[PDB]
Design a binder for this molecule. Structure first.
Ligand SMILES: [Mg+2]
Ligand SMILES: [Mg+2]
Ligand SMILES: [Mg+2]
Ligand SMILES: [Mg+2]
Ligand SMILES: [Mg+2]
Ligand SMILES: [Mg+2]
Ligand SMILES: [Mg+2]
Ligand SMILES: [Mg+2]
Ligand SMILES: [Mg+2]
Ligand SMILES: [Mg+2]
Lengths: 109, 216
RNA sequence: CCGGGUGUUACAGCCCCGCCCCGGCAGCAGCAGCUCGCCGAAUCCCGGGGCCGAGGGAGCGAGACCUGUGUCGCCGCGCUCUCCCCCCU
RNA sequence: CACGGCGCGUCGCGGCGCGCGCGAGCGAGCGCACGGGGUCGGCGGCGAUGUCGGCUACCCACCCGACCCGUCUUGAAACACGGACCAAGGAGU
RNA sequence: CCCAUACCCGGCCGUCGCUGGCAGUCGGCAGAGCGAGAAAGAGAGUGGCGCGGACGCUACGCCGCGACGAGUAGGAGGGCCGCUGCGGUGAGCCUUGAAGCCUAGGGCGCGG
RNA sequence: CGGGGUCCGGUGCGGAGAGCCCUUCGUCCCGGGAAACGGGGCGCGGCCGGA
């Protein structure tokens, strides 16, 4: 009935100043702003959900316009709650500053 | 011959015994345990008798074949894997299903099954979930428990019972088992005030609350 | 109550110094979970997250009286070929 | 306690060390594994005119990177020189 | 706390080294080893039923271990890269369609 | 009614954004608590409220 995930923003790729590695993304999870608070989210699955034009099949339902790129949280980043994430395919650059759902079912509690 | 005795040393740590070699030589009493030095069947036929050879040669060898594999030791089939359970999960605990069709429904937990799946049920009279299996990873175990140490669940229910077959029709055996379990579960949860409504409700996340902050 | 002055334990305290068993008692690099160290043949246990799984005929025992098998080498163990006793189903 | 037989025991210092014989250097099975590189004797869904797969290649978008080549030169993106574009010919015999 | 093509661990390609290993496919005519700390014989001798057992080995081949890989001028090697003609060879192809040319099609090779 | 005076309360801000509000499985019976002034109505016709 309600919402079962947590908001994150796809801030950007793991990068230096002149090089960027697109195989690792940086997520800003809402509400967590320090390293001693990000150990909860380590290993949780994350999803980038977006609409498209063509219909695609969905598990346990009729086809619709929704598509998803899956991934998982790997490790903390920085000192301010930033999180490193790895997805099965590198996220498109058009998702910079957009919503990624981090879920809870890879649970350890 | 000889009855198989148990191991003479308790496991101190995995792979290390409590007693040393000499202590074992003493405890086993080995000082007085010294020791010193198909493919054919004959059948009658109505002629005479024929020596039929079972395990006969194949009538077709393939163009080419793969070689054998090297031997490895630490790999075991899923049947005899050691089963682990989270410390926070004990019989009579409330869980929150996170991924099934019953998303975020508070459900009572009863028993760990043989293959590692949790046998779970919140009495479908109030939260509408039957006897079911659920993976222990995909559930949140809150720190609210009831006492179900004094309830009996049938021994016939198991993973073979819950295994999918093949439209799915519920069986009368399923109905009677669910009734038998819930007739004992329900009075226990009705003793605790405001617990039936809690199980009826559905967990959700609103803005301003974060799982890493909130405790359960 | 405050300010100034005198002064040497008074209606507060502080520092040093012989001994009383270095007076005695805990305790001790202290979860009074930060008062200050260097370590571990004087060190072990448990747990969590991430990435990967390349290689593919290793042999065992059977004895010229047999011809099987594919859980094998090194390493660490347990049980039996001795006899009793205890506990739980 | 990586101690475990009997002897002849000096193979010996006073017993321990440490030698000589004992069908003569042959006890066997099962089982578990922190043991010469992964397996499952574990599972779940969706599939006929709208859906599944197609790295690359066609077009488009985004983030990062990114100065036009050849040549002589210590130094070329150069306010150094040759070069509008395309086809064929073209130089260690 | 952040990250380089640096360092550590793993996979893959190639080069170099071990001037490494394999002719032992020794089968009812046989007995399946030469990885095991110690230069050298699983040494030869004379006296007190069921007929059965994968792959290999273009030796210019196959297989195993380590280390390493920048490059102008220049040197060398390999090209089952390419073009034209000649001697051989493919009981080669082809009017049931060759050469050539075009392609939003399917692929191979690090590359030609 | 607004602005001042006294006085009384709070002040690591409990008249707090480190907070507040709404909170959703649904339906059926009977009982208690709150309400009888309440709830719902392009169901209504007006009156003000805004540059
Ligand atoms: Mg730029
Ligand atoms: Mg020039
Ligand atoms: Mg020069
Ligand atoms: Mg000029
Ligand atoms: Mg000139
Ligand atoms: Mg010009
Ligand atoms: Mg030309
Ligand atoms: Mg390496
Ligand atoms: Mg080079
Ligand atoms: Mg074209």
């Amino acid at each position: 009935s309600g919402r079962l995930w947590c908001k994150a923003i796809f801030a950007g790729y793991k990068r230096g100043l002149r090089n960027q590695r697109e195989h690792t993304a940086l997520l800003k999870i809402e509400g967590v702003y320090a390293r001693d608070e990000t150990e909860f989210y380590l290993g949780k699955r994350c999803a980038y959900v977006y609409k498209a034009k063509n219909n695609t099949v969905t598990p346990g339902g009729k086809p619709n316009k929704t598509r998803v790129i899956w991934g998982k949280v790997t490790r903390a980043h920085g000192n301010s709650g930033m999180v490193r994430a790895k997805f099965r395919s590198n996220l498109p650059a058009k998702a910079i500053g957009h919503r990624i759902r981090v879920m809870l079912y890879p649970s350890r509690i | 011959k000889g009855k198989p005795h148990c191991s003479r040393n308790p496991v101190l740590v995995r792979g290390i015994g409590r007693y040393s070699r000499s202590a074992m030589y003493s405890r086993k009493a080995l000082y007085k345990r010294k020791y010193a030095a198909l493919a054919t069947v004959t059948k009658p036929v109505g002629g005479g008798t024929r020596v039929v050879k079972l395990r006969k040669m194949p009538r077709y060898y393939p163009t080419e074949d793969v070689p054998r594999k090297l031997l490895s030791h630490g790999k075991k089939p899923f049947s005899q894997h050691v089963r682990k359970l989270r410390a926070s999960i004990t019989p009579g605990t409330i869980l929150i299903i996170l991924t099934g069709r019953h998303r975020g429904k508070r459900v009572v937990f009863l028993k760990q099954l043989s293959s590692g799946l949790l046998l779970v049920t919140g009495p479908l009279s109030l939260n509408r979930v039957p006897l079911r299996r659920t993976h222990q990873k995909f559930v949140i175990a809150t720190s609210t428990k009831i006492d179900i140490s004094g309830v009996k669940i049938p021994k016939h229910l198991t993973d073979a019972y819950f295994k999918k077959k093949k439209k799915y029709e519920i069986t009368e055996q399923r109905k009677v088992d669910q009734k038998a379990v819930d007739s004992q579960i329900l009075p226990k949860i009705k003793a605790v005030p405001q617990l039936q409504g809690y199980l009826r409700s559905v967990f959700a996340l609103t803005n301003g609350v974060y799982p890493h902050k909130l405790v359960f």
